[PDB]
Amino acid sequence: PKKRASNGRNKKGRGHVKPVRCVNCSRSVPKDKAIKRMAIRNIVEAAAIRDLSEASVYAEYALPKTYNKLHYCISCAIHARIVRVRSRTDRRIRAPPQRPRF
Amino acid sequence: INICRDNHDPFYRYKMPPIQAKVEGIKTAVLNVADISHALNRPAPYIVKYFGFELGAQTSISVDKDRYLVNGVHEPAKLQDVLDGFINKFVLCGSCKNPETEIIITKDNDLVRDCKACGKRTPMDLRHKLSSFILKNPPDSVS
Amino acid sequence: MRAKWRKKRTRRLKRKRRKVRARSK
RNA sequence: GGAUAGUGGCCUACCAUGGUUUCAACGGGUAACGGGGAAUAAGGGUUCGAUUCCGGAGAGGGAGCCUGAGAAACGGCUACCA
RNA sequence: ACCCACUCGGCACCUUACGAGAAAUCAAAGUCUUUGGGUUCUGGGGGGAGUAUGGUCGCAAGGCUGAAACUUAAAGGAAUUGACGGAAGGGCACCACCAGGAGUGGAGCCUGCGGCUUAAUUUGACCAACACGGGGAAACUCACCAGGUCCAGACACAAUAAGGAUUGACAGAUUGAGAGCUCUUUCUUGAUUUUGUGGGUGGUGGUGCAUGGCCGUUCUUAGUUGGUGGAGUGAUUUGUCUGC
RNA sequence: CGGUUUCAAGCCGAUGGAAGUUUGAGGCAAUAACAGGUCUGUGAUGCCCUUAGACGUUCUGGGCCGCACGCGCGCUACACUGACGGAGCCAGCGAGUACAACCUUGGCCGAGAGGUCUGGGUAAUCUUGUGAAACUCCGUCGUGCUGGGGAUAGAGCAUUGUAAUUAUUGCUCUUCAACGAGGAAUUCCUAGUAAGCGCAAGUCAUCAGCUUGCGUUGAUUACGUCCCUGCCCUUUGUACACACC
RNA sequence: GAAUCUGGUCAAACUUGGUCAUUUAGAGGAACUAAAAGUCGUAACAAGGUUUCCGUAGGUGAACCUGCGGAAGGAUCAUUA
RNA sequence: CUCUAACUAUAAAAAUCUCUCUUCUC
RNA sequence: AGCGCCGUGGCGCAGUGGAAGCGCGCAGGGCUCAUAACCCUGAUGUCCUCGGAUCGAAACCGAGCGGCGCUACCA
Ligand SMILES: [Mg+2]
Ligand SMILES: [Mg+2]
Ligand SMILES: [Mg+2]
Ligand SMILES: [Mg+2]
Ligand SMILES: [Mg+2]
Ligand SMILES: [Mg+2]
Ligand SMILES: [Mg+2]
Ligand SMILES: [Mg+2]
Ligand SMILES: [Mg+2]
Ligand SMILES: [Mg+2]
Ligand SMILES: [Mg+2]
Ligand SMILES: [Mg+2]
Ligand SMILES: [Mg+2]
Ligand SMILES: [Mg+2]
Ligand SMILES: [Mg+2]
Ligand SMILES: [Mg+2]
Ligand SMILES: [Mg+2]
Ligand SMILES: [Mg+2]
Ligand SMILES: [Mg+2]
Ligand SMILES: [Mg+2]
Ligand SMILES: [Mg+2]
Ligand SMILES: [Mg+2]
Ligand SMILES: [Mg+2]
Ligand SMILES: [Mg+2]
Ligand SMILES: [Mg+2]
Ligand SMILES: [Mg+2]
Ligand SMILES: [Mg+2]
Ligand SMILES: [Mg+2]
Ligand SMILES: [Mg+2]
Ligand SMILES: [Mg+2]
Ligand SMILES: [Mg+2]
Ligand SMILES: [Mg+2]
Ligand SMILES: [Mg+2]
Ligand SMILES: [Mg+2]
Ligand SMILES: [Mg+2]
Ligand SMILES: [Mg+2]
Ligand SMILES: [Mg+2]
Ligand SMILES: [Mg+2]
Ligand SMILES: [Mg+2]
Ligand SMILES: [Mg+2]
Ligand SMILES: [Mg+2]
Ligand SMILES: [Mg+2]
Ligand SMILES: [Mg+2]
Ligand SMILES: [Mg+2]
Ligand SMILES: [Mg+2]
Ligand SMILES: [Mg+2]
Ligand SMILES: [Mg+2]
Ligand SMILES: [Mg+2]
Ligand SMILES: [Mg+2]
Ligand SMILES: [Mg+2]
Ligand SMILES: [Mg+2]
Ligand SMILES: [Mg+2]
Ligand SMILES: [Mg+2]
Ligand SMILES: [Zn+2]
Ligand SMILES: [Zn+2]
């Protein structure tokens, strides 16, 4: 039948898109069927944020943050549990899962 | 000892010895592949891999150490007949049916039967898997 | 099955019959 | 012009370059004689029509024929092929 | 450049069914049996097969075109609830592990199986069979066997027959036998029987793959449902469920 | 009562009490199924078969108990926490004779198993307080396949039983093997539990390593997790629906 | 006014070869059906244990894999966390 | 009828199967 | 006629100075409802015949046997 209205692609009127590559499986993947994330994080692990702070010159520091736009294939992403299989009546909800922490 | 063919009963002609099989666990080691190989001017891998091609089962080939294992339950008649298909398709030439023909590549990659008595370049059945096998390993130079 | 390989097999058989023609003509 | 009961490239002679076509020509096939009709049946329709009626066509295959108003006749002929 | 209000055109999106669909769904897949805005091209079961063949284009790889014989009753679409999933998640079990404990498999013996053997090693079980059928049986029990008996063959009909339907038996042989089973010989007994048939009991005889009944397991887990009532044409589903 | 919970269901710790894991264990225990087993339990039986030299029944005897082998329940040992001579002396389940031979006490002979005379008991009286083992104490053995181990091979003595050979069972002596903790793998288990140890009762004429219960000595290590093996619920895809065999 | 016979004339027909249709054997060559207890592996249906499938090209006992491009018929309709 | 923030990381091998398919009525 | 090689448990190689070696064989067991894969445990032997060396020689050497690879038909 039809798995999805958008055919799990989200192209819908673009003819073609230049492919990107997965971070993990490293496959050529259409940029829209290319589930991807902002793995925003501070430069240091949350555990040692104390020690480093008093282990350094230049008090009242900023503690920079490292960023990356990670492109995940379908297979790797579904494998690493970062995307969850869902019921069809549950699949369609495109809203992000409501701000993991608050 | 065979007269190098099956449906051919002369008293004078070039000779081939029969091949046999011993058991391993299961896979049969064939004792007499190098001698027939030298009697047909064709390397042993062609014999073994042709037998496999008409057979359709996993096989093991090791020319440096004489352990030619072909997997399956094959009575003497079956493998001697597959090798008969080998010699008729490969070893013997057209006109005189010479049991010594070499396999030669011209400037084109036309793998061809070449003889000595009639000496023709018999149009080879490149439409067989053993043709690709032979072209993969040039004779007496990549073995 | 894999109709990929069936189509390729048909193409190869046609190629072989064409080359048999080429030798025979 | 000839020829024909009489038109007409019917045939000839001199010329002229034309005629037909995707609106299906020409070629191929037709276990097709065409029709009146038959079967079938809400209506629309599908198939069959060698065969009682109509026409047309044949007398083994082609040709040629006198006679006769009317014949290219075949229970009339001239010839070849079978 | 922004916000408001309206709109034109474009990709789309959310709800809904008002329709329509084989449904999955679709704002067109609607305005389609209440059958008819105009429109070009396609397919008529699956294979055989995009195959053969003849073209055609091509340097070639190959494309466009394109069968039939034959062969089969299904192939197939959506959709259902189960089963499955080295798929995901939520909880479980000492018939799972972990921590360890104690052992089994090593030794001998006993018992139970299989296979070999013999007449037979009677047989049924192959997680839920195997110290089980109380299967720890010297007879039996017994279902195995070499033998020996006996009828515990009703009832009915026919059948004989009181000058005998018939049974029983000391002794010898014969049989282990002290069995009158069999004989040799005689005596006893009397109408219950005896011999045929119709019909009949017994059968640890066969068939648990004909069955009951019984208990085993599935399965000690948490699972199972119907009456309205709703959601689907239905098969069904919900009630049985988001969480804790 | 104190924690912990949208403050709800409840959960955790402590106090108190015998009992604070559903107090402990059990037994009753759903729908639907299986081609599970059993006709060998029946006087439950269908159907088929045999029914007189019988597959019925009975009598004898042989057989169910044999062995080039393998696997699977168990028992005793592989020794020093031991074994052995003696002493010390704690239990609970039970059971036990009628139309007949049970429970055995006590006293007598035997070294023993046994045998005799009596005695009570149809059962809280009698066996009984089953004087059970394991266990403890005091001696001996001294790390040696040796007093561990005792299979097995000889001879005899007893008892039950119509009948013990193919050793019934018990006893006496001699023989004393293999056994040095056991490959791959696998089973069981969380508290009076595991383990050892015995007792009883079913089977029983007579025989237990069997089993059902009972009690004795009395635990290391948790108080968890889905890694293996499964299970339950939910989601999900299936071309599976004889269901991953 | 017959025979014979000049011409042409319609022209059947015969030979000769070309050319075609249909049957037609045919050394040998290459396939497909049905037969489901042949053999080797297990390609696929689940994430089929390397996602499938398609076009293309090479190789590969066989399945198929491989490189490049695709599509969801996928196992993702989903990051203004 | 007034809120816009945190966050991690496995992928070892598993190949296969010839069974019977059975019936619903007041 | 002489020199270089060898002497298996069923087969291929090896260490030959502590005395029967592994893979592959095979009998059996383990695993799985089942088969394989795997896991493991076991059985065959006179490193050729006889001596020297050595505590001990299959083994270092030798006084030869059987078989091989060259010289090459060597009056
Ligand atoms: Mg799908
Ligand atoms: Mg997506
Ligand atoms: Mg025509
Ligand atoms: Mg017609
Ligand atoms: Mg007509
Ligand atoms: Mg007419
Ligand atoms: Mg007239
Ligand atoms: Mg005519
Ligand atoms: Mg006429
Ligand atoms: Mg006429
Ligand atoms: Mg006439
Ligand atoms: Mg556009
Ligand atoms: Mg079709
Ligand atoms: Mg098709
Ligand atoms: Mg073409
Ligand atoms: Mg638990
Ligand atoms: Mg169970
Ligand atoms: Mg287990
Ligand atoms: Mg463990
Ligand atoms: Mg024990
Ligand atoms: Mg053992
Ligand atoms: Mg054992
Ligand atoms: Mg037996
Ligand atoms: Mg048992
Ligand atoms: Mg018993
Ligand atoms: Mg007995
Ligand atoms: Mg008896
Ligand atoms: Mg007996
Ligand atoms: Mg009987
Ligand atoms: Mg009976
Ligand atoms: Mg019966
Ligand atoms: Mg049954
Ligand atoms: Mg239950
Ligand atoms: Mg309802
Ligand atoms: Mg419900
Ligand atoms: Mg409270
Ligand atoms: Mg309870
Ligand atoms: Mg059964
Ligand atoms: Mg008898
Ligand atoms: Mg027995
Ligand atoms: Mg002792
Ligand atoms: Mg007491
Ligand atoms: Mg001793
Ligand atoms: Mg002992
Ligand atoms: Mg003990
Ligand atoms: Mg489907
Ligand atoms: Mg199906
Ligand atoms: Mg003329
Ligand atoms: Mg195979
Ligand atoms: Mg596979
Ligand atoms: Mg893999
Ligand atoms: Mg794939
Ligand atoms: Mg498979
Ligand atoms: Zn990836
Ligand atoms: Zn030749």
Swiss-Prot record, chain B:
Disulfide bonds: none annotated. GO terms for biological process: cytosolic ribosome assembly; formation of cytoplasmic translation initiation complex; negative regulation of translational initiation; regulation of translational initiation. GO terms for molecular function: eukaryotic initiation factor eIF2 binding; GDP-dissociation inhibitor activity; GTP binding; GTPase activator activity; translation initiation factor activity; translation initiation factor binding. Keywords: GTP-binding, Initiation factor, Nucleotide-binding, Phosphoprotein, Protein biosynthesis. One of its GO terms (cellular component) is multi-eIF complex. Belongs to the eIF-2-beta/eIF-5 family. Present with 48300 molecules/cell in log phase SD medium. Monomer. The factors eIF-1, eIF-2, eIF-3, TIF5/eIF-5 and methionyl-tRNAi form a multifactor complex (MFC) that may bind to the 40S ribosome. TIF32, NIP1 and TIF5/eIF-5 comprise a minimal 40S-ribosome-binding unit. Interacts with NIP1. Interacts with SUI3. Catalyzes the hydrolysis of GTP bound to the 40S ribosomal initiation complex (40S.mRNA.Met-tRNA[F].eIF-2.GTP) with the subsequent joining of a 60S ribosomal subunit resulting in the release of eIF-2 and the guanine nucleotide. The subsequent joining of a 60S ribosomal subunit results in the formation of a functional 80S initiation complex (80S.mRNA.Met-tRNA[F]). eIF-5 is essential for cell viability. This is Eukaryotic translation initiation factor 5. It comes from Saccharomyces cerevisiae (strain ATCC 204508 / S288c) (Baker's yeast). The lineage of its organism: Eukaryota, Fungi, Dikarya, Ascomycota, Saccharomycotina. The gene is TIF5. The chain holds residues 3 to 149 of 405 of the full protein.
